[PDB]
Amino acid sequence: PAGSERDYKIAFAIITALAFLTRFWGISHPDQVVFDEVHFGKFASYYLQRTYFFDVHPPLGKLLFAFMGWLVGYDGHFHFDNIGDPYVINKVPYVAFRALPAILGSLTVSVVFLIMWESGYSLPACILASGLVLLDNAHIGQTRLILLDATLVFAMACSLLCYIKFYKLRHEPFSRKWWKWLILTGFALSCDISTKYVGLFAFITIGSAVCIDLWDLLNINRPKGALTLPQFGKHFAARAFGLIFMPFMFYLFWFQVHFSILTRSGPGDDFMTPEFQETLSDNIMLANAVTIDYWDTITIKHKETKAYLHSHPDRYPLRYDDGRVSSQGQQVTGYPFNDTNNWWQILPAGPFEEPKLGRHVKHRDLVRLRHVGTDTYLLSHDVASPYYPTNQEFTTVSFNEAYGDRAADTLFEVRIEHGKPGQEFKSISSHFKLIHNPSKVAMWTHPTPLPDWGHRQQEINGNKQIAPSSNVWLVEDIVSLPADHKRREKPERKVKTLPFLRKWFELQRSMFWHNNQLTASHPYASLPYQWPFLLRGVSFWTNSETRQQIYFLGNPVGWWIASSVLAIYVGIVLADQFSLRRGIDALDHRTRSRLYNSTGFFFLAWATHYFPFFVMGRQLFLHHYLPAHLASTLVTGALVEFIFSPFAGQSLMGSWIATAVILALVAWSWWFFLPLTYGYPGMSVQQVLRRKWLGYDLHFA
Amino acid sequence: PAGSERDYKIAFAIITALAFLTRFWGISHPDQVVFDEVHFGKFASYYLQRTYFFDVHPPLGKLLFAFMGWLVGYDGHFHFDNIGDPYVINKVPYVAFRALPAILGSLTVSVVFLIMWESGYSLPACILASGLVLLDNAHIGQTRLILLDATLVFAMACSLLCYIKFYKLRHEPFSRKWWKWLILTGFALSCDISTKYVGLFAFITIGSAVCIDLWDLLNINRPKGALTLPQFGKHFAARAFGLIFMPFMFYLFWFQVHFSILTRSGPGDDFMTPEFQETLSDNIMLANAVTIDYWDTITIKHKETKAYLHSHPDRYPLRYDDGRVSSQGQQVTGYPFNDTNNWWQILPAGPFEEPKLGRHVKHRDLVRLRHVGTDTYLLSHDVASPYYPTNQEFTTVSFNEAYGDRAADTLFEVRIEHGKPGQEFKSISSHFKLIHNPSKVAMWTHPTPLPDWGHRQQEINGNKQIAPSSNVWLVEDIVSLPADHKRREKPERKVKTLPFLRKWFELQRSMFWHNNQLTASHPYASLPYQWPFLLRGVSFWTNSETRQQIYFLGNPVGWWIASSVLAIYVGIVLADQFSLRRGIDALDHRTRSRLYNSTGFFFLAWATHYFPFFVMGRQLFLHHYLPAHLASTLVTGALVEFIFSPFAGQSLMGSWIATAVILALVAWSWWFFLPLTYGYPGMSVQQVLRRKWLGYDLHFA
Ligand SMILES: CC/C(C)=C\CC/C(C)=C\CC/C(C)=C\CC/C(C)=C\CC/C(C)=C/CC[C@H](C)CCOP(=O)(O)O[C@@H]1O[C@H](CO)[C@@H](O)[C@H](O)[C@@H]1O
Ligand SMILES: CC/C(C)=C\CC/C(C)=C\CC/C(C)=C\CC/C(C)=C\CC/C(C)=C/CC[C@H](C)CCOP(=O)(O)O[C@@H]1O[C@H](CO)[C@@H](O)[C@H](O)[C@@H]1O
Ligand SMILES: CC/C(C)=C\CC/C(C)=C\CC/C(C)=C\CC/C(C)=C\CC/C(C)=C\CC/C(C)=C\CC/C(C)=C/CC[C@H](C)CCOP(=O)(O)O
Ligand SMILES: CC/C(C)=C\CC/C(C)=C\CC/C(C)=C\CC/C(C)=C\CC/C(C)=C\CC/C(C)=C\CC/C(C)=C/CC[C@H](C)CCOP(=O)(O)O
């Protein structure tokens, strides 16, 4: 081909278009909560409802997710709870959440091309680096989910580009462009460290690159004049202000935004000292949830179908259509509307006693439920239900039965979701499962209506599995408790204000301490020595019916080539230094400086983003190598311009063929592992075997 | 005072005499097995009876201990078993065992003085370094026990001295003295790495010091002539042969000695492949080994407490003191004596069948255990045990329960320690854990007796953690198998011979793999960042009747001063380099070179023996810093010669006063903590409080 600015622009546009294509293609396919979408989606939602929470990560990533959610208009109440629940059946915009990391990944590929272009390399080198980042399965798989690692990688690449822009302005110090790019480098580093704490490693890179520069600026005998000590002091002050103080100010600003958005009580208030509880303005749910007492009359509403637990005088038919025999007891149903047949009085287990006031119902208490309209008592037993031969019938019985020979079958455990010992059962806020005490079945319902004999109402029966979310109920109203009762009018709510620095210091210390002790084990934790050559990969999500896995791993051909070129660059530097020690140059001035100033800089970044992971001994995963691998993709491109080099660039055909072959091979490797990256096409068992290269636990073999 | 060779010799003799005094004074006081004397004494004894065993450490240290034991003439059979048993009532020479590390510590102090003397420093600097090593409580406390860290420290100091001797001969290359000191440096490094694997760090130090030298030898433009490439090749070959190949040969020789001494079966044969069991003869000491068959009656003995698994008709009480409710089942206990209630019949899982002969029990088989004296079957279930709310109760049940509705809870897996698939379960030699099949709890016991209701016997319960060594049992006797039975006949007994390299490779791989997985938790594990300033110390041995503790920690004043001088040296080097960048020398040629060639070398050693502990993420203790701290004591001395410097050494009075004051203060600090180092004088409670400087867990307050 050829080389010109128009060709550079065409290649950049094509690379950006293909990046946006690959990152966004099939972004909504997993359509389910995946490996770590749980926590970050929870925190983004908590940002949206302004309820306070606690996390060990710096807030900026979750702020970005919450901004994306707020842009659409979603507020909702779908705080994520478990891996493997459908987003689409919950009216939540997960695609909007996932579009931000995809945008950042596409911009990461564009920024890689920009870094190679600005450094002065030829077109094939920029194309090779941008293509290695483009055709990488790990980068694609990380920018697909609700995960804040894509923001980290994008911020590191932006810091590299900003520092390359700034360093080229070293011949015009303290100008407007000079200060602008200094502050921009500081801001990129600030975003990098405000996403995840490992972003500190970028501060090492730009740190080292500054230090060497300062050393060059401190030489009393240097070709480009000499600086008096006050001038070097001005240079050092500028570097410290733009690279240390501004990043800290932006970090503090992000915590200021975090504190200002969160002004309501929520999960995570207890990690703070009581003064902070005094400033979170405990509100909104507080009003809606009142502790339920024995002898209260309540309504019980199914979370998913919105049906109310209901009864009426009609009885189950003697025979069902399949010939089974019922107890012919009073029907218990789910009813969508409000009427008196929804009213149940919650009563103690054990013998009859006259009513008492103020006895709170608590988590895991055994209770009876008396249907007010018929004066009967809820009961389950091992008689098969109307529609489910495996599930227990629910019915009601007389007082004499409930406190006599059938008493045990009238006892139900109130199991509060996420309940703790002694926790009070509250209207609205205590989602719960109602567990039949003899059998441990959970009271359950579903949408398909009963026949006409059951008034086309929902069936109520006993589910043998307790785990399903369809077993969850809530108490909507304490019907018997008047609107003016003291039990509803004792808020005692006052909210004070603390200085920002005090709150920030308390939160920072608590976050550091919890990150120092609150570690949850994961079966796919990796070690730094396994990353550069992809010895093992992590699995995020899988379902067995469609045979679809989303096993996360890099592109083996691309990673192996990048690491091998890292080794080749090490060898080239060693050989050049050894030949120089003998007094042989063997390198042109232009080709030496670049190999030590630009390419070396890239090799610095990789090192500064890889080696510090050996010092840290907590759990680390393969995605932690995503930043460093990025720098690995840069040196590769440089080394293709280097070894195949004859502005002198006549007959780049050698580098053109080199990059064409390497990128075609990496493209074949990316096509091979593409299903494992996306999980859309169900793959056969023998096809799973072909991907078992270096011992990858695909668990579909 | 003054300075002369006679004064140097007098100071050296006095320092050596005081070293031998301090290391040997009260060496036999603890007169009991202490923190890690167990393992190393076990291995030294096994060396003495020539019975094969397995360890993760290189053999040389235990060879030295066994040589010391053999010199006295002790062979005996007192293989150590538990921490806290008296040596004197067992006819064992523990003082002879402990004299070797004491000799090595005294020689370490002498070698420190020799290193400072040979490098060219003045008398006060050598005295200061040797006194800081002399008056150090950690070095004294490490050279007191049966522990192979003193050998490591002595070998590192010897390698430093040997390399300093060798480097001074650089002006007469390839001479007899040159080669002699090269080989001696290699041999010292070989001993260092053949004691403990962390001795590899010394190879880093002498490695780096060589590399710099080679760089200086590679310069084509250097003041002392120029070397052609063949001459530099000869130099590099000499370094590689004396520093890489000879150390490996000595390491291999120590394994050859280890293999030649061990030609009898012993504990640790099962870690090898059956060829190796074939190359070890079938020996007499603890000869017993007979495969256990279903329907045999056996006794089951706890390895650590020696209690027998036991039962009797008495039942658990309905309520424990804390209000918990038991199953009221038959008690299962640990009993120290021999009686028929220790007898259990081992039976198949699955349905009842009439007895069959010759069905061997194998690794990971599921079994039942029938208590012969009560005709009941061992059972565990998720009911909390007498003393441990977290651990499962062990009880027994009827035949009808064990082969009926409770059958699953009667099944236990026999998991042989280091077992392989299909391995036969044998009396005596198969140490095992008994894993409850439903819950995966391990059958466990501990020393604190049950109350009177349990006859003051040991509790048996289900430990949720399987890894602990306290889960290990063994079968002591096949009670049902008569003494004259064919199964007790001993077969073939033929011993083959393997090439040394094959045995070494198998043993090395197995040792590396077990060190990679076989880690036992310790409550006093420390982190590298706590070492240089003594933030926490380890306790070795203590008895409550005499109020004597042997809490192991360094000398706080000496360690703090040494680390502070390390920091001061860093600052001095930084300031000198910064002034040189401005073009200001500020240092004489002689005072510069020393500060970069001798003192810097010492600072190298410290670094190369401290920083590599951050890369390693296994358990580390304070004694691991003993080598590096040694180098810290050297730079200190150098920095006292440096800053107080006016052969020019007129009026050393400044350095004399400096070293006198520092050593007097360190001597006061060593006197303060001396009881905690020795444990001879019982100290009062208020005296224990005075030693609580930086949060030291003395547990006598
Ligand atoms: C185990 C050890 C191994 C294997 C490797 C160790 C790591 C290595 C080798 C190095 C570490 C990193 C190093 C050395 C530096 C990193 C930080 C530094 C110095 C810079 C940051 C990166 C960074 C933005 C570098 C900027 C480079 C830009 C593209 C230069 C622009 O063109 P420009 O006119 O200046 O070129 C030349 O400008 C000359 C002017 O004088 C002129 O004369 C020439 O004609 C020619 O015009
Ligand atoms: C964060 C970084 C910081 C803070 C610190 C970094 C670490 C530093 C500063 C350095 C790292 C270690 C370094 C540089 C070297 C270690 C290994 C080396 C080079 C040697 C091993 C140690 C080692 C046996 C050194 C031997 C030194 C012996 C005592 C020299 C004997 O006297 P000798 O005649 O040679 O002195 C002079 O000999 C000259 C001959 O030319 C002559 O001219 C002078 O008149 C004068 O007679
Ligand atoms: C004098 C200067 C000289 C010689 C030369 C000029 C050098 C120069 C101009 C620039 C660079 C300077 C250098 C080398 C460092 C400066 C950065 C620094 C130390 C502070 C600035 C960064 C900030 C704005 C905020 C830092 C947040 C704070 C408060 C603490 C974080 C704790 C971290 C980060 C703990 C990392 C482990 C982590 C727990 C793993 C979990 O990991 P994860 O959360 O991902 O799961
Ligand atoms: C080309 C050369 C150049 C450039 C310049 C010349 C350099 C020169 C002349 C000399 C030095 C060379 C250098 C830098 C290294 C050489 C050492 C080396 C790698 C091998 C030689 C050492 C040996 C004789 C035997 C080594 C035992 C073996 C086989 C493996 C051990 C594994 C280790 C040690 C695992 C360390 C962790 C440990 C598990 C923690 C537990 O700890 P612990 O057991 O205490 O509880």
Short mmCIF file of N, CA and C in Angstrom, two decimals, chain A residues 215-221 226-229 232 577-578 580-583 614-616, chain B residues 215-221 226-229 232 577-578 580-583 614-616:
data_model
loop_
_atom_site.label_atom_id
_atom_site.label_comp_id
_atom_site.label_asym_id
_atom_site.label_seq_id
_atom_site.Cartn_x
_atom_site.Cartn_y
_atom_site.Cartn_z
N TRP A 215 15.22 13.83 36.07
CA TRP A 215 16.65 13.56 36.08
C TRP A 215 17.33 14.24 34.90
N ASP A 216 16.74 14.10 33.71
CA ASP A 216 17.27 14.78 32.53
C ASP A 216 17.22 16.29 32.71
N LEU A 217 16.20 16.79 33.39
CA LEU A 217 16.10 18.22 33.65
C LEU A 217 17.03 18.69 34.76
N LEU A 218 17.62 17.77 35.52
CA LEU A 218 18.50 18.15 36.61
C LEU A 218 19.97 18.14 36.23
N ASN A 219 20.32 17.50 35.13
CA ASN A 219 21.71 17.45 34.69
C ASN A 219 22.26 18.85 34.48
N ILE A 220 23.36 19.15 35.18
CA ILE A 220 24.01 20.45 35.01
C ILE A 220 24.71 20.52 33.67
N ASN A 221 25.08 19.38 33.10
CA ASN A 221 25.74 19.33 31.80
C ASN A 221 24.83 18.54 30.87
N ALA A 226 21.07 24.53 30.43
CA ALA A 226 21.14 24.13 31.83
C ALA A 226 20.11 24.92 32.61
N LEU A 227 19.52 24.28 33.61
CA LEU A 227 18.49 24.89 34.44
C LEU A 227 19.09 25.24 35.80
N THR A 228 18.88 26.47 36.23
CA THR A 228 19.23 26.81 37.60
C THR A 228 18.27 26.11 38.55
N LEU A 229 18.66 26.05 39.82
CA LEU A 229 17.85 25.33 40.79
C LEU A 229 16.44 25.89 40.92
N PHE A 232 14.40 24.40 37.97
CA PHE A 232 14.05 23.01 38.24
C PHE A 232 13.02 22.92 39.35
N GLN A 577 22.67 -2.90 24.61
CA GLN A 577 23.51 -2.43 25.70
C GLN A 577 24.84 -3.17 25.73
N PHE A 578 24.82 -4.48 25.50
CA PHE A 578 26.06 -5.25 25.49
C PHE A 578 26.98 -4.83 24.36
N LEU A 580 26.99 -1.84 23.01
CA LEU A 580 27.48 -0.52 23.38
C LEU A 580 28.61 -0.60 24.41
N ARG A 581 28.59 -1.60 25.28
CA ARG A 581 29.65 -1.72 26.27
C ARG A 581 30.98 -2.05 25.60
N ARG A 582 30.95 -2.85 24.54
CA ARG A 582 32.09 -3.11 23.66
C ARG A 582 32.47 -1.91 22.80
N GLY A 583 31.68 -0.85 22.79
CA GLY A 583 31.99 0.30 21.98
C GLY A 583 31.45 0.26 20.57
N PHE A 614 2.58 -9.05 42.08
CA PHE A 614 3.25 -10.06 42.89
C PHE A 614 3.38 -9.62 44.34
N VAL A 615 3.54 -8.32 44.57
CA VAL A 615 3.64 -7.80 45.93
C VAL A 615 2.32 -7.96 46.67
N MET A 616 1.21 -7.80 45.97
CA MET A 616 -0.11 -7.95 46.58
C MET A 616 -0.50 -9.42 46.63
N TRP B 215 30.03 -6.37 34.60
CA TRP B 215 29.81 -5.15 33.83
C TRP B 215 31.08 -4.31 33.79
N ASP B 216 31.71 -4.13 34.95
CA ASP B 216 32.98 -3.42 35.00
C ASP B 216 34.04 -4.13 34.18
N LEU B 217 34.01 -5.46 34.16
CA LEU B 217 34.96 -6.22 33.37
C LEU B 217 34.63 -6.22 31.89
N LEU B 218 33.43 -5.77 31.51
CA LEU B 218 33.04 -5.78 30.11
C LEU B 218 33.28 -4.44 29.42
N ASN B 219 33.47 -3.37 30.18
CA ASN B 219 33.70 -2.06 29.61
C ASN B 219 34.92 -2.07 28.70
N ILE B 220 34.72 -1.68 27.44
CA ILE B 220 35.83 -1.59 26.50
C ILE B 220 36.73 -0.42 26.84
N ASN B 221 36.20 0.59 27.51
CA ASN B 221 36.97 1.76 27.91
C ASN B 221 36.93 1.82 29.43
N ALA B 226 41.89 -3.25 29.12
CA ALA B 226 40.70 -3.72 28.43
C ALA B 226 40.83 -5.22 28.21
N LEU B 227 39.70 -5.91 28.29
CA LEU B 227 39.66 -7.36 28.13
C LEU B 227 39.08 -7.69 26.77
N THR B 228 39.77 -8.55 26.03
CA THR B 228 39.18 -9.08 24.82
C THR B 228 38.03 -10.02 25.18
N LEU B 229 37.19 -10.31 24.19
CA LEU B 229 36.02 -11.13 24.46
C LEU B 229 36.38 -12.51 25.00
N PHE B 232 37.07 -12.08 28.79
CA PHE B 232 35.82 -11.94 29.53
C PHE B 232 35.05 -13.25 29.55
N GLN B 577 24.15 11.59 45.07
CA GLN B 577 23.84 11.53 43.64
C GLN B 577 23.24 12.85 43.15
N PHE B 578 22.37 13.46 43.96
CA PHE B 578 21.76 14.73 43.56
C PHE B 578 22.81 15.83 43.46
N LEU B 580 25.98 15.33 42.81
CA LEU B 580 26.77 15.02 41.63
C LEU B 580 26.07 15.42 40.35
N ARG B 581 24.74 15.37 40.32
CA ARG B 581 24.02 15.77 39.11
C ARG B 581 24.19 17.26 38.84
N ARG B 582 24.23 18.06 39.90
CA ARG B 582 24.58 19.48 39.85
C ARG B 582 26.05 19.73 39.54
N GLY B 583 26.88 18.70 39.53
CA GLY B 583 28.29 18.89 39.26
C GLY B 583 29.14 19.17 40.48
N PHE B 614 8.44 -10.19 50.06
CA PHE B 614 7.15 -9.67 49.64
C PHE B 614 6.58 -10.45 48.46
N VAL B 615 7.45 -10.95 47.59
CA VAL B 615 7.00 -11.73 46.45
C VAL B 615 6.42 -13.06 46.90
N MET B 616 6.98 -13.65 47.95
CA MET B 616 6.48 -14.91 48.48
C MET B 616 5.30 -14.67 49.41
#
